[PDB]
Design a binder for this molecule. Sequence first.
Ligand SMILES: O=C(O)[C@@H]1O[C@@H](O[C@H]2[C@H](O)[C@@H](NS(=O)(=O)O)[C@@H](O)O[C@@H]2COS(=O)(=O)O)[C@H](OS(=O)(=O)O)[C@@H](O)[C@@H]1O[C@H]1O[C@H](COS(=O)(=O)O)[C@@H](O[C@@H]2O[C@@H](C(=O)O)[C@@H](O[C@H]3O[C@H](COS(=O)(=O)O)[C@@H](O)[C@H](O)[C@H]3NS(=O)(=O)O)[C@H](O)[C@H]2OS(=O)(=O)O)[C@H](O)[C@H]1NS(=O)(=O)O
Lengths: 189, 189, 189, 189, 189, 189
Amino acid sequence: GIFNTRLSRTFGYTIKRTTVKTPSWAVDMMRFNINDFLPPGGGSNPRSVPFEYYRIRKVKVEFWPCSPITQGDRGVGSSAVILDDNFVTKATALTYDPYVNYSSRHTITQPFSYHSRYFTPKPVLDSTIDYFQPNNKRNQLWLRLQTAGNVDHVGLGTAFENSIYDQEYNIRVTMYVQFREFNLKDPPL
Amino acid sequence: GIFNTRLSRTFGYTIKRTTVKTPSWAVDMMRFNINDFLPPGGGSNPRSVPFEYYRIRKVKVEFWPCSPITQGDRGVGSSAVILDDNFVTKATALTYDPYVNYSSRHTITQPFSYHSRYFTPKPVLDSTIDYFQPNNKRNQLWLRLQTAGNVDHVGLGTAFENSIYDQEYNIRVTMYVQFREFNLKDPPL
Amino acid sequence: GIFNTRLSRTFGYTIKRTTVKTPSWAVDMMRFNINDFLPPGGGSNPRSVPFEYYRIRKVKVEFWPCSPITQGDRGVGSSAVILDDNFVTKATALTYDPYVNYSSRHTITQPFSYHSRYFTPKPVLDSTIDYFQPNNKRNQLWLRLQTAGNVDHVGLGTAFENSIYDQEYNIRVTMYVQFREFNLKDPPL
Amino acid sequence: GIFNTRLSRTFGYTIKRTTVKTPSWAVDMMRFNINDFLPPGGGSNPRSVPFEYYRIRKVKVEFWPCSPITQGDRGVGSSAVILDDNFVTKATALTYDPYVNYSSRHTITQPFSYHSRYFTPKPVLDSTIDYFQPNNKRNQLWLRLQTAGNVDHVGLGTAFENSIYDQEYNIRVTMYVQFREFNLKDPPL
Amino acid sequence: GIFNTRLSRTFGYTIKRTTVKTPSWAVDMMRFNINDFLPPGGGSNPRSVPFEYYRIRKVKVEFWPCSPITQGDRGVGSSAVILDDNFVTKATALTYDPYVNYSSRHTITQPFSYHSRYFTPKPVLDSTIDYFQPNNKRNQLWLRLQTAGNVDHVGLGTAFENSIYDQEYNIRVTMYVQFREFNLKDPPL
Amino acid sequence: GIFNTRLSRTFGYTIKRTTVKTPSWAVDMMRFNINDFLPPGGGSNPRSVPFEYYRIRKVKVEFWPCSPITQGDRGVGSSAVILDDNFVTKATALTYDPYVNYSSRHTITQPFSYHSRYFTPKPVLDSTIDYFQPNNKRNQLWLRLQTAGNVDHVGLGTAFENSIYDQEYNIRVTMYVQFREFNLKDPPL
Ligand SMILES: O=C(O)[C@@H]1O[C@@H](O[C@H]2[C@H](O)[C@@H](NS(=O)(=O)O)[C@@H](O)O[C@@H]2COS(=O)(=O)O)[C@H](OS(=O)(=O)O)[C@@H](O)[C@@H]1O[C@H]1O[C@H](COS(=O)(=O)O)[C@@H](O[C@@H]2O[C@@H](C(=O)O)[C@@H](O[C@H]3O[C@H](COS(=O)(=O)O)[C@@H](O)[C@H](O)[C@H]3NS(=O)(=O)O)[C@H](O)[C@H]2OS(=O)(=O)O)[C@H](O)[C@H]1NS(=O)(=O)O
């Protein structure tokens, strides 16, 4: 019983100002979990979408700027796809862009420019070995939609060039999911 | 955002015994409401299936017998489709089968025989005028999935021939519904 | 169990003379209810025609004159289709013809001439809102044949030029209906 | 104004037990009249189906058993079509099956088996001469739908083999009729 | 007598400022009535457009900004189509965008960006049941153009992200209507 | 914004009796103005049809008789088309029919006979020079729909033969007009 749908979530991210003169970059990570998109249900149905299995097909991360088009001290960054839960260490002012030479690098124009990334994440099945599957719609694993313990999906790391002014963003993540085995429970009343 | 699914519900019905010698029939009615198939949800989602609109496409009423194949004093009844909320009055021992000459009559062999009816019900929009639409999948009205006040659908009346022995049935109603406008709400936690 | 047929009825209508010199017109509406055409039945069958449902297809109004051809003080009037049960106000002698400019106007010669109209009426579901359907034979609704509470249909209003003489007509109505769901009941005797 | 419809009626028939050891048969007759299917009407319409003429096209006699499938002392009988109102004399325990060598004989398995007969009856126009028409849909006579004096149609005789146990049946006769000349009368009220 | 035309109306909407730091959204509703587009007439014609019936085909809601392109603290919202008169409750600072996961969601870039929505509304025939028709130009109901009591059409709800600065808009609603039955009345003078 | 419609108006005309023995004719004129067909509007809309420009395409003058078919002293007259506002002088009993030799003469049978004239009128732009355009639908001038000062259109003159009895007529003029530039004004309320 397949049901392809779309789930979204919005949150903020700010790159604080720095008095540093050099071009330094701010590094951070981004994971994706389905608990943040799918709330708990009620009653005999533990989740709000009554299905048993799921598998995330795609994610769309949108960096919607919060800064005016008149803001100066512009910069240039990079967003890369990291499917293994080993990101570059979080840094405030690093002397280089680590994600620049990555094959999945897209340039981030800053601060007042929109940046989208559309990709297929991978689940963290074993963080010790960090193995994942290649892209195959027919062979992608089905995970279970747990009650409160779903596994973290992974796949984006960023590097933003710091500035004299604060750079704020409203990040909207949209997960395109595919469920299976409609499992609604209908007790009496 | 269409989602065709199937919702079921099971309950009992008994035709008590009678010392009456004549062939008399027991008349009863059967309505269908979605509150009995779809429970209330939890939180910002008032229902367990997160959709706004619905329209019932078909219903399958199954009379599953509870009586052995050795039971005697067998009989013959009738099930008809009544799409207007004006049934023959409920009777214990009526001297005739009212639903026999109906164009939608199917014979009910009793007591140990299975009887199915598959039809398209109609909602009770105005019980004073009792108007309904003909069968058209493209023009069928969309109703709202209310929180605790959904409208009764209608469409089956029965007439069972009484017997010296009690005739029990387990009735399984299956509604084939079609929802629209996925409306999940995801507050923070 | 479809059954197309024809029903009719006859009654009188008169236009009393007026000493007024100006061209004045007399206004009156016309409703249509089935209880006037279909008497009650007898016994278990509340109506003489054993069906549950109906839906009117067409109506044919016939203004049969009662007057001679030699009558003078001839005039001219109009009739129009009105599907809301909010007609022009009834009037004796109005200084203009309200129904003249309506798109559904058919001229009326007076006093000794035949006049006919052939159209689709509509019912009165909600007199507050006064809504209905366009002409469609497939999507027309099915009403219930009540015992003593059928709904009034609508669809004609008139305007007759007054005169010095009394103008009397014999009005014949004819309905073309379509029943369904043969519902005869055969108790013993 | 033709209207083909279907009228039904249900009643009982029992073959009482006998201590006789031999194979004996119980003979009985079956006539069909429209008064038993069509009740009287009400008011100016003397009958409940407002038509003038009729002619019976077919009849379906169904012997629905009342006995369990575990009942022993089974037997074998015969049902024949007798279109002339001269049946074999009614007998309780006759030493042979009279209807066995009839060209219209169908075997009746007893007691827990269903038996149907579908045929075209004939009216009793003159019981002295006992003449009837062959089967012709285009040339079949139209009779009048009288008020309380309709003519008996004829066409089935049976022979049931007696048993130590009582053999009960619920007999459902269905007449497929064809009316003509819709004659509804609509007085005022 | 069909006449397709276009009626417009302009009004303001402001999202007041908030000292709240989090991303919160301001929720509001939008209904459409023809009294706000069609004024009352004069004399025997109760309305300024001399027709009897109407049905709204489409509506174009245009959010024309009032804010400069240099305004900061930008945001992202959502507009959805709600055809049933049960909107999300009006809120000043809600912790999430309720209309984000709706199938009819369009993103609203704020504050200095234009947003249009072009859709087919539905009338509020019964607010208790909240039923409406699917899109069909041939089967769309004709309503009556009342004098001062027309029914509210429905179909848009919004969610705007709050800001430190006031966000003003000039909203221009354009209804594309279709009238019927030209009913001009021409008394003497 | 073109809108072709039809506007009507009804009024009386009587040819009084004369004791004169000779055949004499009664001459009269007939002009057409849009103020007599289109009333004043209300509010910011000065007219009831909300358009700016107009041009009259055709006019249908219908002489509906008021006299019985038994009336004697019958006669013969003439109706001609006069597109220049210089009619034959109005006369009570003229010794000849002036409009008889006109190329646009149609015979008027009197008194109980219907007479129609269907033609294209012309406006009175300059009564001193009396110039008009030939018939061309594509090149016909657009006039302005003034508030209370529209220009008179012209085009019919008549000659009725007098009689011992009074000859009354109900004259129905129908103008087929074509408007342009829908100019509805919708202030607030
Ligand atoms: O059915 C009854 O409850 C009952 O009916 C009558 O008694 C007979 C039985 O019905 C009859 N059975 S059968 O079903 O016909 O087979 C039979 O057994 O004989 C009995 C006795 O008859 S006898 O006495 O004549 O011998 C009787 O009514 S009457 O015959 O009309 O007088 C009453 O006893 C009773 O009817 C009354 O109640 C119903 C149900 O409402 S409730 O009672 O409040 O629960 C009333 O229904 C009202 O109107 C409808 C409607 O017109 O659609 C609804 O109105 C809402 O929807 C419209 C829009 O409609 S639509 O266009 O979408 O289709 C809105 O525009 C309205 O604003 C809505 N109403 S509001 O917002 O609440 O105001 C709604 O169900 C209800 O609304 S309300 O009550 O008007 O508010 C019914 O009208 C009333 N009878 S009446 O006499 O007042 O007409």
